[PDB]
Design an enzyme around this catalytic site. Sequence first.
Site, mmCIF file in Angstrom:
data_model
loop_
_atom_site.group_PDB
_atom_site.id
_atom_site.type_symbol
_atom_site.label_atom_id
_atom_site.label_comp_id
_atom_site.label_asym_id
_atom_site.label_seq_id
_atom_site.Cartn_x
_atom_site.Cartn_y
_atom_site.Cartn_z
ATOM 1 N N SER B 40 0.840 -1.192 0.000
ATOM 2 C CA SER B 40 0.000 0.000 0.000
ATOM 3 C C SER B 40 0.877 1.245 0.000
ATOM 4 C CB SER B 40 -0.943 0.006 1.206
ATOM 5 O OG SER B 40 -0.225 0.109 2.424
ATOM 6 N N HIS B 158 -4.450 -5.922 0.579
ATOM 7 C CA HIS B 158 -3.750 -7.173 0.310
ATOM 8 C C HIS B 158 -4.021 -8.249 1.356
ATOM 9 C CE1 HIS B 158 -1.172 -5.459 -2.947
ATOM 10 N NE2 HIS B 158 -1.502 -4.344 -2.318
ATOM 11 N N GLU B 167 -4.657 -2.208 9.373
ATOM 12 C CA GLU B 167 -3.963 -2.778 10.525
ATOM 13 C C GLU B 167 -4.656 -2.480 11.851
ATOM 14 O OE1 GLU B 167 0.132 -1.548 10.465
ATOM 15 O OE2 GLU B 167 0.244 -1.620 8.273
ATOM 16 N N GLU B 210 1.575 -9.507 7.292
ATOM 17 C CA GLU B 210 2.329 -9.008 8.439
ATOM 18 C C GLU B 210 2.190 -9.890 9.679
ATOM 19 O OE1 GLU B 210 2.245 -4.262 7.194
ATOM 20 O OE2 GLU B 210 1.834 -4.896 9.257
ATOM 21 N N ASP B 245 -3.825 1.363 11.714
ATOM 22 C CA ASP B 245 -3.405 1.909 10.428
ATOM 23 C C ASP B 245 -4.565 1.748 9.455
ATOM 24 O OD1 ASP B 245 -2.291 2.757 8.057
ATOM 25 O OD2 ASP B 245 -0.530 1.456 8.137
ATOM 26 N N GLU B 293 -3.417 5.815 12.280
ATOM 27 C CA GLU B 293 -2.522 6.142 11.174
ATOM 28 C C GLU B 293 -3.278 6.212 9.848
ATOM 29 O OE1 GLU B 293 0.768 3.423 10.714
ATOM 30 O OE2 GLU B 293 0.736 3.703 8.537
ATOM 31 N N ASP B 318 1.504 8.630 7.360
ATOM 32 C CA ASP B 318 2.294 7.619 6.668
ATOM 33 C C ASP B 318 2.414 7.982 5.191
ATOM 34 O OD1 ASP B 318 3.596 5.324 5.754
ATOM 35 O OD2 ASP B 318 1.785 4.088 5.810
ATOM 36 N N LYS B 343 9.616 5.444 7.595
ATOM 37 C CA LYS B 343 10.005 4.372 6.685
ATOM 38 C C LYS B 343 11.168 4.832 5.816
ATOM 39 C CE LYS B 343 5.380 2.347 6.242
ATOM 40 N NZ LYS B 343 4.206 2.229 5.337
ATOM 41 N N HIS B 371 8.204 -0.821 9.613
ATOM 42 C CA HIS B 371 8.634 -1.727 8.617
ATOM 43 C C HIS B 371 7.761 -1.544 7.342
ATOM 44 C CE1 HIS B 371 5.300 -4.807 9.710
ATOM 45 N NE2 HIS B 371 4.874 -3.584 9.828
ATOM 46 N N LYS B 394 6.361 -0.139 14.950
ATOM 47 C CA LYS B 394 5.548 -1.241 14.462
ATOM 48 C C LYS B 394 6.338 -2.003 13.399
ATOM 49 C CE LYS B 394 3.008 0.815 10.613
ATOM 50 N NZ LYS B 394 1.701 0.889 9.903
HETATM 51 MG MG LIG Z 1 1.153 1.590 2.950
#
Ligand SMILES: [Mg+2]
Lengths: 434, 432
Positions: B40, B158, B167, B210, B245, B293, B318, B343, B371, B394
């Site tokens: 994503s 996904h 998340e 994840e 998230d 997030e 993000d 990130k 991550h 995270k």
């Molecule tokens: Mg993403």
Amino acid sequence: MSIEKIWAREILDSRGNPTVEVDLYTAKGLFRAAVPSGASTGIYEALELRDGDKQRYLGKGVLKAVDHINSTIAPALISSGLSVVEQEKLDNLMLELDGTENKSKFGANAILGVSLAVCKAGAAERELPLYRHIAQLAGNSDLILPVPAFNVINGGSHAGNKLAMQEFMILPVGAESFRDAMRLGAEVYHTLKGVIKDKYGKDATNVGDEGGFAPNILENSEALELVKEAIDKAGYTEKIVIGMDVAASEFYRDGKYDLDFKSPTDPSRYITGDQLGALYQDFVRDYPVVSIEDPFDQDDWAAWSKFTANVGIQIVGDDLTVTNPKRIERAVEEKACNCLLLKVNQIGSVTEAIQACKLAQENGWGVMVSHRSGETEDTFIADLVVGLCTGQIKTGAPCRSERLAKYNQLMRIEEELGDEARFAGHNFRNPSVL
Amino acid sequence: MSIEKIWAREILDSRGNPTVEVDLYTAKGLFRAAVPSGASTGIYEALELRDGDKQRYLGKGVLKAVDHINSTIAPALISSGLSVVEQEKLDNLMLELDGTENKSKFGANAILGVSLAVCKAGAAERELPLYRHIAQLAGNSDLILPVPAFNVINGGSHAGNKLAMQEFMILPVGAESFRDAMRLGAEVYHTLKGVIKDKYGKDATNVGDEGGFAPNILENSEALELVKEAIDKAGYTEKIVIGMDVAASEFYRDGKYDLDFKSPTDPSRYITGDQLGALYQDFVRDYPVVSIEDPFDQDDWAAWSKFTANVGIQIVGDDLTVTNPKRIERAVEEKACNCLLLKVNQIGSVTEAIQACKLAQENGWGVMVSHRSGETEDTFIADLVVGLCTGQIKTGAPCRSERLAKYNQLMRIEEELGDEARFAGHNFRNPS
Ligand SMILES: [Mg+2]
Ligand SMILES: [Mg+2]
Ligand SMILES: [Mg+2]
């Protein structure tokens, strides 16, 4: 002398359970190793020592094993005077220190963690890469890159589906190299996701413990159909064959076998060993299945020998042989199988594992180095399968990095070997014939 | 001089896609780093260079990025005569060699792979652990063990379910230490499996990218219910809170938001940003949600500022900020959020990532080191979060070792620090 310091700690494996990690120090630096953990464990496997403290990790702590290393095993080896290159002598000392058959005093997970760390330390002391040090320990001199066996469809006791049989694997025997074998494996794996999604929806494309998809299917023939369809659509019908881990001990009930053992118990659906064998014959005839692991129960010896005598494919003993010389010797005598699944944590040490491997190879058996369903970021078995020249390894689907770490390391090894790198290919069963 | 050899190769990530791995050699030995990969991904992220060869890895190969390192980047850094401790000069050199704004020439995955390897090499050259080298690169003195944010329920683009939001995380803020926080996280994660299995069957206990479970559910409030159920049942109601998230960019539909975007399209089910904000208010009210997030689209700035102004919890940028100082500056002035998701592959270099972190912290933001959904066995971000003293990270569920490798490394760092080790705890937003 050789060993400056040994320090064990508690880490988490690929499932979120505690396991043993060992830091061994010499003058040449730090050497770290971790111990895997099985889910479908055979009853004859060496003891995996858990704490049993219900108010800590639901009783799955390994503080006892860690303490056994730090308090008892570590000072014994330090004051032994043995060089880290002396794998057999150092392993024998730990065996003697334990003094039990199944390593029930310290735990196999305690002994193995040290044994693994010792081996890596011995390699550096020898100024050799790990796989070459292992080669010398086994008496080998001509390394071989293995054919990888990717568990792309997960079933069995710990998979979220009805699928009774545990593992459905693909083997890129027709690949050019190992790095090429990795590509063929991934492309089919990614192709398989689409095939499953198109037929069962996106809910069936989530993965199990070993990175393989867990589709909501029951019939094992359908799992073979999906995989076969994925191989063909990827365009590798002539290069990729199929392997299986039945793990029949997990659905062995009342002398019979239950191919729907994750459904409410109903003895009327049970089948005999003969019926189960006839089902395998259909699979071998209808699909490119060249290998079957644990087709029958760990103690159903008669079914093993009878079925093996009537097939040309590879029959892999896992829970049957538990990487144990005393069990392997019986299986050799009875011709129960023609291949050994090598799990270091099933026997408890590197020395014993190597002995188990050569005992198999001496009798014309194939050897498949294997991971456990619960793994870590450790990549020891990658160097192991190369050093032992077994020509075949299963260390997961091309998914989840506790699987890829091994596969990536094997690509590094092939790279390091250069023009002397040999891929087992179609001779994965007897790589020495290459 | 310092760098003797830089060699890149093609490895596979946690979901089976090719990614860049770099081996850097100095007199002190071999330093290896690998590049994560997102699914994503925000539209403003630095370029992830893929080969595009349909006959190889379905076009996901990274041979070009690997080649850019081995053929162009490596001999340029070696000829520079720069010490590996000179992180900033070496990163600047690659930025200028690339010469493009979004690293489109070499690829961000090519530049970062070297930048990460350089950093590890620099740490050993300084005779320091990686987290201490990073701390000095950022000008930090006192280190912090972060509160882990375990992604225990997976939804989004996904994940194999209807769950729209990406998340659902648990944060052991009430833990005694990081090692204790790992136990709390794992025990709830294992408890959650039973909770999910009891209600939806074993089919719903398989995992996503994840490591979090992917139950066949649609309602995001249900995911919160299941998580809250697991926390209470595990006996940690007072010690474990919830983070989210949303990744709203993934179901942003030209002005509105589709909370059922994995279903056949029906625009009548779309909701406004105002409605979405009201939903979050309900989540914060009914559940111990302390962090959200990407609650809105990466370009929906007005919604971000409006929502952040009316909440007291952590709002994390993000895809909005993509670890980019230019985007972060705008978000600071418009008060779009109050926390940065860090990130390194979103910006492309360690230097720029540190700059992004310090810029956020200078303006009172929290920082959560993160991550990507596609990870490797690399454990860099574990040392990164401690060195940057952000107090929160995270890096997945306590499942799949591309997640655990980070968590295990963080347990090693805590053990190594000993007396000096401080757990962020309830100050995860402000360990400063
Ligand atoms: Mg993403
Ligand atoms: Mg088993
Ligand atoms: Mg097996």
